[PDB]
Amino acid sequence: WEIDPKDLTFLKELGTGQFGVVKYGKWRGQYDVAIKMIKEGSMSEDEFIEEAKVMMNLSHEKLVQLYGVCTKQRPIFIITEYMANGCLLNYLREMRHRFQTQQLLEMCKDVCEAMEYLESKQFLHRDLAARNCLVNDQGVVKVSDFGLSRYVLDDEYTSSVGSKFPVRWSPPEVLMYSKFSSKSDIWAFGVLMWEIYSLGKMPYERFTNSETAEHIAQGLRLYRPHLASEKVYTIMYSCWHEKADERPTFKILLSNILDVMDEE
Numbered sequence: 684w685e686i687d688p689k690d691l692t693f694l695k696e697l698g699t700g701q702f703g704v705v706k707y708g709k710w711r712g713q714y715d716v717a718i719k720m721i722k723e724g725s726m727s728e729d730e731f732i733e734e735a736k737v738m739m740n741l742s743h744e745k746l747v748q749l750y751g752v753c754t755k756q757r758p759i760f761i762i763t764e765y766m767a768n769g770c771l772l773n774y775l776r777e778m779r780h781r782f783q784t785q786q787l788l789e790m791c792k793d794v795c796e797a798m799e800y801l802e803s804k805q806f807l808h809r810d811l812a813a814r815n816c817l818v819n820d821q822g823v824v825k826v827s828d829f830g831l832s833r834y835v836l837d838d839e840y841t842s843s844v845g846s847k848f849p850v851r852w853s854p855p856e857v858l859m860y861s862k863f864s865s866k867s868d869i870w871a872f873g874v875l876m877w878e879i880y881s882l883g884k885m886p887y888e889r890f891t892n893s894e895t896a897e898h899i900a901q902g903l904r905l906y907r908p909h910l911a912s913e914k915v916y917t918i919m920y921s922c923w924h925e926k927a928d929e930r931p932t933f934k935i936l937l938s939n940i941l942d943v944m945d946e947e
């Protein structure tokens with residue numbers, strides 16, 4: 684599973700993530716890769732090293748494939764699939780694209796296909812948002828950095844009160860009881876569907892992070908986005924039932940998105 688660090692070639696800076704510097708490279712001088720350079724004291728290295736075994740066995744076309752690790756060095760490196768068009772949230776905000784609703788529906792299907800794969804593997808993402816989704820050269824949308832939230836050492840991210848915590852993508856049982864489940868990832872999907880049809884708009888945009896958690900409890904749910912059909916909104920709304928047991932599964936939601944495009 685270990686990748687040779689000298690087998691990698693740094694070519695361009697892909698930005699900053701939770702674990703620092705991310706770069707574009709090439710493995711063996713032919714195959715494209717993304718290199719996450721883990722910043723000192725940002726990750727639970729020990730726990731991540733052991734769990735990378737299970738993460739590598741997860742192979743779905745709409746999931747950002749972890750090719751391997753460089754663990755016999757400081758900083759340690761994570762080699763993943765390269766997505767040319769970058770972050771889905773940034774891609775949704777670029778007005779130039781001038782997306783059809785059929786394209787936004789296709790984006791949802793790409794995230795849902797990946798999530799049903801993760802559900803069938805009893806694997807939680809734990810931070811499903813557009814910011815953690817990527818876009819390749821073919822415009823194919825893929826689920827990224829799934830489960831890596833467990834190894835984040837950063838205090839502002841781990842705490843439900845913190846400035847980095849995914850408050851807006853979180854259901855009431857998470858914000859209140861720290862009750863993470865399949866249904867907490869299910870709530871996040873409805874928020875991601877909203878981000879897509881809202882074209883990268885921030886959920887609960889008018890509100891502050893503190894004011895978001897208060898309204899979410901009172902039963903305030905996201906409105907119907909301008910680009911969303913009545914049938915498409917019924918799908919994102921079904922993810923936000925107060926009783927987690929009443930929310931559907933990624934399997935059902937997948938069937939839901941596919942019936943909607945056959946009737947688009």
Ligand SMILES: CN1CCC(c2ccc(Nc3cc(-c4ccnc(-n5ncc6cc(C(C)(C)C)cc(F)c6c5=O)c4CO)nn(C)c3=O)nc2)CC1
Nearest residue numbers: 697698699700701705717764765766767769810828831832
């Ligand atoms: C003008 N152009 C210039 C190039 C630009 C561009 C930007 C980019 C591009 N590709 C990629 C860019 C990246 C990439 C770059 C920077 N930061 C992150 N990032 N973000 C969030 C994140 C969250 C977590 C938790 C635990 C869940 C909280 C953990 C993480 F480790 C991260 C993390 O690393 C990523 C995603 O891997 N990756 N991968 C595969 C890419 O393929 N490709 C092109 C697009 C605009």
